[PDB]
Structures are given as structure tokens and as C-alpha cells.
């Protein structure tokens, strides 16, 4: 069956979490709340001891990173490091060269992309 | 290492500073004793997490109103970090 | 090509294989035993069922379907089957041939006519055909193991087949669904 | 009652022209509510002998009576169809998901 | 690490002292102390060439050769990829799969086999009462007595 | 070493009898309003009962308790997905308090009617009786000094056929009728 | 006693637990507003409300949907370990606003500048603690310059 | 507000809120004592060590 | 390994030796389930463990010797499984490729699954029995003997069935020994 | 589309959630 | 657009004649076996290979006089929660536990009693202080986790609890 | 939309609603073995099984084997 | 178009659902809120008479704990004692000032360590505290 007559008061079992987790002394009298608020605020992963480490092993948001280019606030502070000519990179709003098609109703498309919703793009681009 | 159900008595210990922390200061002291008496067994001489608990023991003490204890604690802490390799440097702060 | 071209065949001399006797990688004789299937007075299609179960290797819980490994049913008495209320005459036969005039609509009576094993041999293809067909090895290499006798008497009393003890579960009789 | 023309719909799958939850006393007495706000007893209703079995269940036009208990002490004749039932004129219509219930 | 003894044997680092591409030289100042004091019995070797191979590699005690690409790769990675060269034996690689996650199939009851419930029959939980029995003195009785009953009902 | 537990304390009730008595078993039937459908409980179902989820990998004990110690007794580490798990966890009880808490303002305000359900669900159910105060719900009261009489539920099992087998009553039994296939 | 039992009376309302068993995508636009409300957004969750009427609007419209349980409130002060004398009115006023997703803002952005305003709430927090330093500090020193050259 | 993602110094390390509060109960004590130079140095390296942070 | 402990001092003896020799635990990890023995070696998914650790695994659905079974109801207490992190690494790439027929996109995704090599090193068992439990009738057994069947089993064979398929009359009747003794 | 976030929501992974090590007093110390 | 040609490149000896000759057949060739077996892993082969899991759980339980419909079930209703998967292992590499399993589901054993809302400690209505010292109920739940802190394994703490749960008596030097 | 080829569970003998009852499990299986697997009660909750051992299961069937051919004789 | 028939079981699930609706709106059609004493138990009447009687008869639920907690006396069983332990419970985290013309010498946490310091607390999987306070704050 994919009927399932039950109380739906077992979909959310509190039997792991009473109140005791939220309220950390409530058999006492004292109403002290200790809530993890969100996912967010997750601070991360600490070793319990100094004995057992936590391993090493990477993940993308860390095995891949380039080298570091002096960015503008680098070179303010320091200017020893400004030592050629590939340092002076402009303001840092200056993205890069348009890269893309910028397509009627569409978005910004990609090179080599899809071409079946220019058409109106195509006849723009020919120019009461 | 000796074989503690450290995942018990370190729920134990959490429960102890939220009864710190709530201002109930006789309990955390029952709970850090426990909590104290287990990692004195677990752990090796001037370990890190030794000197920590009886750090948070002597805190405990010193709330409830048995100073002198908080104050011999306290100063095992320290004669303790001194004869440590690299202590935490977060500890020695804490401890002073 | 992996596998060849050039092909054994039914008209070249060279003949088709039997499987039983056959050894490939794929193919297993050490671990089986024999069955004796008693089909007086039981639905042709659920013996064909059953038979198909133990034919297979099914019924083993090591069964790994790439493994080809049987166990041997000695089906006796097919005289017997019973097929329930009118079906022995409304329950068609067909098959096509590739030719003009490619159509035989045979009734079940008729096949018994000529040969009664010849129905036990054909609601086995089908129940072996379910969940082996798109490859020829693994559709004929079990029906081998299917030994049919219309009556008591059979050559393999040296193997001494066990009486096969099931009870069809279902209470209903058979029905035919054909699309 | 009778003047009325109960609309109801519903749900059906599969071939032959079936509500798939066919309808009962207690839902012909839920519509009378809902419609034509008569409140009454659903025992009163009864059923053809036909749909007695099924329930209801076939789209398109049903009906089914309605005893309207006492009158023989408000003198009703000839001033009614008859005395002692009305007509409930049913009419299942089958609609997708979006619009039914059940 | 097998019963105690790292896989992992050397690790090669080629890089230039002078010329461009600062990132391996940053890792050999500031990751790689903490690496060699951690797992020692690794021997690093530094091998210093005007034009660099921006690989790091590593070789194993089977004799296996294992490479990462550093090229432009920020410290953190080289590091990374140092610990990646550590943690594994570079002995096979099977996919991770119903099939492969036991890497050996053991039995310790023993394997199932044709002939181990062969021999085993259908059973009865209570003694059954057998057609064929000589019937007590109740026995007689209480049967005679239905067959009797049902004998007067239908006459 | 290993952990068993049902519940947060690690209590439980004596799941083992005393000795020479009868056990106490859970229903098997499927909980239900109505009495006849009778079915037995789905595996599904017996995961709910028994304090999971539908599903071996929520809510149990196959969730809260850790995969690994260190040999030592040291425990784990919090992953991010065991934290935003607990964070779940505090949201159910969030809710609950939330909505009691809202509950009991409305009612300290006098904002809970004494008429089940809403005008919306009124209007829809002749369930909910009519709440009229000082007249009678149906017309004027009834006089202080049955339906199925007259109402027939009889549904005919098999319809009765006409009696072939007897010549006469073949032909008084006619039934005068064309057959028409709708246009 | 045969007789109604002699209180001080005390009224207890209700929770509702409510399950979502079927796609919001097979239905019109209405009832999945009405889904939106029961805080419902697809098969399979489940969802805590209150009791009050406009509530009990909303699980009839979706009724054919979500399944649902109810709770009184001792049966609730139950289900969570609560001691007796603890109402919910006290416990939701400890707790903090803070908590994930914490409002119903109108639109995207509105959230977006909402959590902004935490974020600089934060920033402006240390930085009016460092300021207040200085201020003391500043104090200290007027007071010192003031009384040592007087 | 991914833009303007901040991280209190009085949590990401413990060790700076601990000394600051150190020298908050410290300079407390020197107000109470009377002395006027020490609540200056302290409330100065206090000062010094929030914004080194 | 504690032994098997019981109220009971006959049940003690009795079982005890029982206990002795290979054992096999199946274990809960990572939502996958693994049928493990002594010297076995496995991939779970990846656990934040430094290499050559020692671990202890804390889920354990069943025990087992080549004698006893110790099927936990969903889980068993007083079971030592110890292992020993041998690998941490990314397995066998799993490519998917994902490309709409209609638009111009193409998206080469690398699954490399990360994963964590496990040898076991001990398995030890350490129950607390309360009672016997008669299986057909459901009941503590008051009184422990291992002497006599617990629950005894008879044959079927009225000879009131005509169509009952018969087997060999050797298994059919064959009565089994007694194990405990 | 907004989220409720009603069912269970494994958080997001970010680089604030990096393991930070314990700074050490020096050896000779 | 981007058809991946640079990798596939690389695998086109997996090939026979043509396509591994001839640079864009062995493309297109790698390109459709490739997206292919993706569809198929993701949207179908759980379900064929779960088929043969519980094919062979069934044949397993057959031997034993019964069936995958009842033994699942019972092993729901026993609170067992054997994955399939593990049945399976059982039933092939372990079988007398399989059927110790199957034994226990046969049997009238009750289930396991459903777990247990957590309750409040009578302690917790003492109002105190009633007229230096811990609140009943805290200490109460102090006796409660140090109890099960001696549940798990052996340890040097001892069985006692009353001395563990004073423990702090020892840690203070008396004035 | 193509046919269903995978592997199905075979059909199983026709339960009486005495199934509906607790305390009575619908898998009915007793067997030979049946009495050698002991039952007992571990203070978890769990139980706990003692059966035979393999070979003492196969040396079971091999006596019964030798038992059944000791009249006709052992064929191949 | 829709051919073949729907088969009988899919449309016996169909009732199912449409019974699973009744069951819903019989729990809308139920009181907004219940009248009770002090002293009885919180389950004394109460609307589950007749599914108590249809499928409660010996079977145990899985509301079983609960329900042995409603079938029993209230432990505040009057309302002098209900605000006799009221009044000593406290609020810790609460806004603005607590009252003391008891000790001034007991010191709670807050004014002992600063609003911006937690104790530092062991974190493993079993023990979870709450990550950045310095978040919470709104
Ligand atoms: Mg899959």
C-alpha cells in the first residue's frame, strides 16, 4: 500500500530531541536556551583533542586555488612587492573583454552556445 | 591509552557549563568533578585536556565559594603548563 | 569483431550445440541435483512456471544472472496437465512464419495432437522468455534441463530424481493474456 | 429538491466512464448541504436498485429519491408529484486533478 | 599505512630558486616543514632546475610512481596533494560499489552450498491426530456421536 | 564499544516479560477509522511505529549515534551535516513552541470561538450541527408526550431471469421492449 | 463521584501536525498559496500549527492533500519532556528571533537586504565597542591631564 | 550580503576575547583602587589590541 | 570475549563455550551496511580519520560464530569492533555526461568517490543473557535444561490427505540430534 | 523560488568552516 | 560548443575498426556510449539490480518454507532493519544466521516495545530552595549520565557509582 | 516504454485472516532444524541464537541421505 | 486516450484516500479547545472513545509512554502551588534588569566573563553547542 493510515505524530519523532536539548536545564527551573540557530552559523570541524588530528584531505574549494596575484590593497601597503609590470592590473572593475552574446529575451548566451533563440538578436545586430 | 567512554563523560562536561553558564554553579562542579576524575584517568601526566577540565573545575569552585580550592586548582593548572611541551596557547590565557 | 561473423548454423553440417554437454566459462555442472516434477493433475502454465524456477537457477540463492547454472527437471506424466474449464479449446497457439501466408492460429488441443511434450516445451520457452531474451545463450542453454515425458517411465532412475514437493499457492485457475 | 440539478465532479481513470470513489448516502445529503442548503436526515435517501451494489459511480446523470417524511397531515395530494419522494437529479462530471477532490 | 609503515617513500620536488612562478617555493617555506615533521620517515627531495617541472610526484615502496600537477597551483594545493600522496598505497583503484566494498569474500559459518538445507522437510509445530489410529474409548464415543448427529439431522 | 538506544536518556520500557507470563505485542492491524477494511501494517508502517522515519536513514537511532570512536574511547567530530542536522532537530521544537505559544496568546484574548471549524467548512458539512442558540434546528419543537421502515437497502445479489422453462409463463412474463443505441 | 469535577477550569487548545502526501505540482495555484501558508513545499514534509482559525481555513482547502494529527497542549507539554507549571508562552519568549529563515519578508531582495542588516549589525557592534574604548580612554586622560596640571 | 560577509574577532579566536576581557575586569579593579596610570596603559593595550585585530 | 553473563549459572557454562573462535559483526556505516570478519578489509565512505589510526565501530546490527548468532533488534550493546585506518583516498572515476539533444550544452561531471580503507583488527562479544525463550509459545522459560528440545517438532503426515506430494519417507521422518548436550 | 527550509537541509560547505589550528607557545619557552 | 573531444581522444583503443581509426566516429561513438550508460545509472540499473538482490533474499527464504512477502514483513515488525543488501550476504556467505533470522521471525517473540517519550523526574516539582546545595533534579540526571557512563565497556572508573558521582570531594583541599 | 524483465518474487501460499491477530507472525516456517535453534533474551533487547554448527548441519543431511539409500542402494 | 481498465486494487487505494480525507475533517470538526480541571488527568474525556474501541482493544501503540503519562493524576494539582513554583523559576538570557536585594557577592556568568565569551565546550558528535554566538544577536 501506498496508503499509509498511521499518526503522522511518527513522521516527526521527538524521542531523539525532547526539550532537554534545546532548554539544556529544564528539570531544574531555569530556562537557559542554547539553540544552534541555523545551518549558517556552522563554525567548523574541531578536533576533540590534541592526540587524534583532524586528517588532511582537500576538497574543491581547496585543491583547486591558484597562486596569489598582488591584488591592489597588497600593493598599497607594501610597495616592495610591486616588481613588474604584470602587477599593475587595472581598476579592479574592469571584468575582461565582453566574452558572451547578450541575446534578445535570453540572457547572456555563450560562445558557441545555442543559436536557436537569435533571431531577433541576428536582425538587431544588421544595422508616432 | 586507557579505554574512557570519553563521548559520555564529554556530554557530561557540555551538560556542565550549560549549568555554569545558566548560573546554577553547585552542579557544574558535581559534573566537572566527574568529568575530572574520568580524564585524570584517561590521559597521561600534564596532558592538555587535564589542565583545561581543572581549569573549568577551578572556575567552578571559585563560583560557588570554596576559594582556597579554586585557588590551589588553579595554581596545579599552571605549575602544570610549565612542565608541558607546547602548551595551547589559548590555555595559558585562559588559566592566568 | 569480438564476436564472429561467419557463424555456426542449422544447415551447416557442423550442427548446433548441446549445452549440457557443452563447457563454457559461463556454464556450471558441479553443483547441481535432480528434480522429479510429477504434472498429473496440475495447471500447465504454473508447472511451466515452477519447472522454469528450477530450470533457471532461481531458485539458488547464489543465482548471479550472467551464471548459467540449473538444476535438472525430470517433468513426467505431461498426459496429465490439466488445463482448466474451456481453455484446452479457446487458448491459441500462433507463430509466424517469413513467407506469404505467415500466419498459424493452433489451438492447444492441437499441439496435443501431435505432441503433448511439445506444450510443456512451449509454456517453458515462455516462462524462461521473461526474463531471458536479448541473448540466445542464456534463452536456450536452460531449456535443456527440462527432461519432458508424457507418462511414468524415464531413462534417468540412476540419478535419482527427488520428488519435487509443491503445492500451487494460487488458489484461482490459470487465465490467458495475450496483447 | 426537485427543481434543483445537483452538480458534482470528480475523478475517473481507466476506460469505462467510472468514478473511481463512487458516491454514497452520505455525500448526496453532503451536496444537498452544500448547494441548495436543504438539511436533512441522509437515511431518508434512497438509492436506485441498480446503484444499491456499487454506489453510485457512473458519470454523467444519475438520480436518486428523497422520502420526505410526513405528509399525510399537511393534506399533500395532487399538489406534488407524488406524496412521499422527490427526484434528487445527480450529475457527475469528471475533472483532472486540478479541480477535484478524492 | 600498512601495520605501521607509511606506502609512500620518497617525494619529488622539482622547482627554480630564481625565476617565476613563486608557489612551490612559498610551499617549501611555509607547508613543508609541517609535513616532514609530521610524517618523517618521508624522504623529500628538492631537485632545483632552471626550468622546473611544475609536477609534484610521488614514489611508493612497491615501486609506483604517482604525479600531481602543481602548475599555478596556490600552496594550499601543493599541500593538499603532499597528503594525497601520503594517504594512499597507490596499490589498485576498484570503483566504489555494492560488488567492491567487501574487498575479500570470507565465510566464517561457511558458504552456502546445494546440499546444506537439502535434507530438511516441511514440519508440524503440533503432533498430528493420524487417520489411521485405533480410536480410545472417548475416541469411539465422541465420533459415533457426530456421525450419529449429522445421520439425524439429515433424516 | 557499541551503542544502543531508542530515546535521548537511553531508556526504554522491560522489553523482556517476567518469567511464565504472557507478552505484550503491538497492534498488527493498520491504524484506521473504519472497522472493516482490516489491514495488516506495511513495513513502512512498522518503521514508523518503531520510531524511524519511513526510512532506515532518518530520525532513529541509525541517525543519532556515531559511526566511530577512536579505539580509546576519544569520539567523533562534528560534520557540517550533523550540525545542520541538529539545527533540524531545533527547528521541529521551535515550531511546536512557536505554535503552542501562539495558541495560548489567541485563547488568553478570547480569540478561540466556541464553533468548531470555519464559515468556509461550515457551509460545505451537514456534520457540524447547526448552531443556533434559542430556536429549534429543524423548524418549530418537536411535541413531549425511524427512517428504515419505509426506505429499502436491499441490493439483489443476482437478477432474476425469465422463466424459459415453462411455457406459459415465458410469454406472461414479457417484457415489450426495443433496444436503442444512442444518437 | 457521579458529579462534574470541581475546578478552577483551565482551557487547553490544540496542534496541529500536518504531513504533506502528495506533488503540489499536480494542483491549481490556490491550493498550493494555501500549501505555501501550511509552510508545505513539497511531497514528503511535515509541518507544525497552531489551532487557530484561520489555520483550520487553510487544512480544509488542502485537505485532500495533507494528512494530519492533533495535539492538546498537555499532550504536547508531554511529548517533549516539560515540566507542568512551564507554559509555551514563557519558552517562546526565551528563544531567539534569530532563529534560521527568521521572517516572511514580501521579495528576494527584501531577504537579501535583510541579512545584510544582520551582517553590518555585527560590524557595528565591534566597531561601537572599540569606539566606546576610546571615549573611556579619552575620558581617563582628559581627567589625568586636568588633575595633574591642577 | 555575500559581499559583506563579516566574522567577529570575538569568535573566530577565543584567545583576543579572553585577554580583552582580562583587561576589562583589570581596568575595572585599577578604578576601584584608585590608580589612575594603570586604567590608562590598560584601556591603551586593550585599544592597541583590537585594532592590531 | 568478558565472557556471556547470566543470573543464571547452568546457561553460563553452557553457552559459554559457544563463544569461542572466528567471529563476524555486520556493521552500520555510512548508511551502508557491511558483513565484516577478523582480518577483512573495507571502503566506507570517507570518515575524517589521520591514517593509521584505531577505531572502534559503534552500530552493530548482528554477531556471529560458527555456533551462536546474535541477531540485535535494531542494535546490539557490549560489541567490540576494532579496526585500523589503512588507506584515505578517491576512487575509480565514475564519469557521468550530461548533454540536452536540443541546445548546445555539454557537461563532463568527474565522480571520483571519496573513500576511506578500513582493516579489522578484533571482534569481541560480550552479552548479558537474561533468560531462555521459548519460540512458539512466547515466554521466558522459567527453567533452563539443555537436556530436551525446547520447543519439539513433529512430522506431517496424517495420511487425511490424498494430494499431499509425498517425499522420500527418510526425510520425511528424520528426527535431529541434540545439540547442547 | 524561497525556501522554507521545512524538511532537513544539509548546510552549505564555506570556507569560514576551515580547521583552525591552536597557536603554540615556542619549544625553548 | 564543447563534445569533450579531448579526453575521449585518449580512450579510442576501446574501439574496433572504423571508429578507432577514424578520429570523429570514435567521438561520436564515445560521446553516445558515454551519455548513455549515465541515463541508465542514474534512471534505471537501481532498480534492476535491487530486482536480483531480492530475487535472491526470496530463493534463500524459499528454502526455508517461506517468502521475501512475509519475511519482509516480520523483519519490519521484529525492528531488525537488515538492508536488503545484507540479507542477501547473510543468506549466501552466513547461512545459519539467515535462517536464525528467519527463525525469530517465525516465532511468537514479542517486538520490541516502541520507544519511549523522555519524562519529567518528579524532582523537578520540589520547589526549591524550600525554606550551597544542588537541585534534586540536576543531581538526579547527574546519577543518570554517570550510570551510563558505566554501561559502556570496562573501565578504570569502577562500578560504583556513588563514590564516582562525589568525585569532586577530591579535587577540593579542605580549609 | 518498455517491458518489465527484472526478477519476481515468487507467489506464496494464501493467508486465513487468523494473520490479521498479533502475536502471530505470518511467516509460518517449521523444520527439520527448527528445534536445534535456541532462543535467548539479551538485556538489550536483542536476542540471542544458538544453532549447530555447518558441517554438523551437513553431516545431519548426510545421515539422513544414507538412511534414504540403504534399502534401494546408492545409484551414481 | 485511456484503453484498458483501471486495475482493482489502484482504485481501492483510491477509497483509502478518500477515507484518509474523512479522517482528516472529522479532526476539523473537533472543539477548538477543551475545558479541564486541575487535579484530573490532562486525558479524561476524550474524542478517541469510539477508535479506542474499534482498534485499541489489546494492542500496544505507539503513543504507548505518552499515553501512561495522560492517564495519570497532574502533578500541579492546584493553582497556589502552579505560581508557588512559577515565581522561583528564572529566565537567564532574558532583556533588562534581575532582581537581587538577597547576595550581592554571588556572581552570575555573564558579569563574571563578558557578554562575548562562552565557556569553551567540548565538541564531539554526541555533544553539540550552539557555533557562533556573536550570530544570534538580532
Ligand atoms: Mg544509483
Redesign the pocket.
Known sequence: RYRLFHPRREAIPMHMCPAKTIFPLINSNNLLVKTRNSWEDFTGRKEFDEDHPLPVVGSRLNGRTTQHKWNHWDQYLNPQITQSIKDLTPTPEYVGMRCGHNMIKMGWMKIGGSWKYSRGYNDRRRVR | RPYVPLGEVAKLELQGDYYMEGGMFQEALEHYGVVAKAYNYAYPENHAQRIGIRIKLSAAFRQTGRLESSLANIEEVLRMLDASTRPSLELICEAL | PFKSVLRRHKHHPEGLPLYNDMSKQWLCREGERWWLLDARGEQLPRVAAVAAQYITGQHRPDFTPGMITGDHVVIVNIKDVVMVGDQWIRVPITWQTAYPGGKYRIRLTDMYERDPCMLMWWFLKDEVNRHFVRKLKTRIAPLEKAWLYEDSIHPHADKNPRPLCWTDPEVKGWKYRDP | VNTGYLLFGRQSWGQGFLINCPLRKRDVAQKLWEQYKVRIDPRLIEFREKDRRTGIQELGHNWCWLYLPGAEELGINREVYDNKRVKVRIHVRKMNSMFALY | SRNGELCLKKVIISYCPSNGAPNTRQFLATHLPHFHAKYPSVSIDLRPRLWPEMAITGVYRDGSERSYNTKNLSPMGIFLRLNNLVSTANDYDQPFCASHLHFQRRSVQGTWNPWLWNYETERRRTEAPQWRRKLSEKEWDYYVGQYSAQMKQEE | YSEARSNYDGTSLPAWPAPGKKPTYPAALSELRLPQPRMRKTRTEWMYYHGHGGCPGKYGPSREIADFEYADGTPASISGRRFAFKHHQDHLLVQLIRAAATVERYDASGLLPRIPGTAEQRNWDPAIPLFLDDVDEQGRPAPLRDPSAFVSDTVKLRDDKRPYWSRRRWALTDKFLVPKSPK | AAAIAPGPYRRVGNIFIVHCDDHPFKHSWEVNRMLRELRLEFKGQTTIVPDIPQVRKRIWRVRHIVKVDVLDLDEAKALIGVPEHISFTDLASQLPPSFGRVKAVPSPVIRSKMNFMKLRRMRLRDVLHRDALELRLLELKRSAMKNAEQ | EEKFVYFSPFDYDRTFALVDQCLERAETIFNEIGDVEGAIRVLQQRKEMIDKK | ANGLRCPDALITRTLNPLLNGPKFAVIYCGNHQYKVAVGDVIAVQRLRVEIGSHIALKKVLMVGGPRFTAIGRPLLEGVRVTAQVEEQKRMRNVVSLFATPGRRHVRWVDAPHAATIIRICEIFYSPNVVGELDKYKGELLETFTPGQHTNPVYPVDDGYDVFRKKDKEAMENATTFLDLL | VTRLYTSYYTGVLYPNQLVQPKQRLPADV | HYRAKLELDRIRSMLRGRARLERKVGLKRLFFLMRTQTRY??EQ??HWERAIVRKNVDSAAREHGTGWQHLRNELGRQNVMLLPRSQQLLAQYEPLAFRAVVELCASRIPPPPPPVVASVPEESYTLWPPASLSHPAARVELRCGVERVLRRGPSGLGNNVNELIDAWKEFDVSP | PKKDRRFRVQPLPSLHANSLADDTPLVTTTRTLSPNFRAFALQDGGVFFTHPSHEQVMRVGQNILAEETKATGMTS | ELLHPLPVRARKMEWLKRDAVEENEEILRRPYYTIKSYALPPAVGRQESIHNSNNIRGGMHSSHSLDLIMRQPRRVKTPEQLRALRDRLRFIGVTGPMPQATSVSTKSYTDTYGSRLRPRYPESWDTVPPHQPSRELL
Do not use: D, I, L, S
Open positions: 545509472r542514474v540499473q537501481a
